[PDB]
Amino acid sequence: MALKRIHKELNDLARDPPAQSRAGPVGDDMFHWQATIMGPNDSPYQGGVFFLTIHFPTDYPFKPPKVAFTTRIYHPNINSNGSIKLDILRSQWSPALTISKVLLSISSLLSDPNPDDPLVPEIARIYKTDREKYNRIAREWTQKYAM
């Protein structure tokens, strides 16, 4: 069941790339994928290429995939271990969601952080009180780790 739906998504992702991202299986293993996502245009991550790892549970699509950044990034909702603060990855998951929709969601979150429910409280604080500094540091980290 999971395997069948997982090749289905592979085609759909190849034919219709979500938000300047690329994604596919780690060689033979269909339950482990690598992805890249581009920093959104006119975000401070612009120009960056960010690596993601994706692990599908055995009972996918009824349980969410595990999705994490492996590229360091400066963002209130993504922590130093690359965990991503998206409801759909945790409690709001539904089998009507897809990896394409997750990648779309990641892109939207990069463009518009949610500092009120952060994974990194101090970065959220900077985002709120000194956005110029947040943009500067986000850009610096993009230049250092993703470019």
Partner 1 sequence: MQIFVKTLTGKTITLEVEPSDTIENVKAKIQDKEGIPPDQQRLIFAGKQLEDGRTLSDYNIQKESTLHLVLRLRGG
Partner 2 sequence: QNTIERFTFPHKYKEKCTICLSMLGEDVRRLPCAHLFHQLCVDQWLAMSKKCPICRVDIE
Q: Which parts of this chain interact with partner 2 (CB under 8 A)?
A: 1, 4-5, 8-9, 12, 61-62, 94-96, 98
Q: Do 77 and 113 meet the contact criterion of CB atoms below 8 Å apart?
A: yes
- Coil, strand or helix at 25: strand
Rounded to whole angstroms, how far apart are CA atoms 109 and 98?
17
**43 forms part of the interface with partner 1 (CB under 8 A):** no
Rounded to whole angstroms, how far apart are CA atoms 126 and 80?
16
Residue 107 CB, nearest distance to partner 2 (Å)? 21
| Partner from partner 2, partner 1, none binding residue 5, C-beta < 5-8 Å depending on class | partner 2
| Partner from partner 2, partner 1, none binding residue 114, C-beta < 5-8 Å depending on class | partner 1
Helix axes 131-145, 121-129, angle to 10 degrees: 130
Residue 105 CB, nearest distance to partner 2 (Å)? 16
Q: Of 8-16, 64-72, 81-89, 136-144, which segment contacts partner 1 by CB under 8 A?
A: 81-89
**68 forms part of the interface with partner 1 (CB under 8 A):** no
Q: Do 79 and 69 meet the contact criterion of CB atoms below 8 Å apart?
A: no
- Coil, strand or helix at 52: strand
- Nearer CB in complex with partner 2: 81/91: 91
- Nearer CB in complex with partner 1: 81/96: 96
Smallest CA-to-CA distance from 56 within 104, 7, 21, 20 is with 7
Q: Which residues of this chain interact with partner 1, rule CB under 8 A?
A: 85, 87-88, 90-92, 94, 96-97, 101, 104-105, 108, 111-112, 114, 116-117
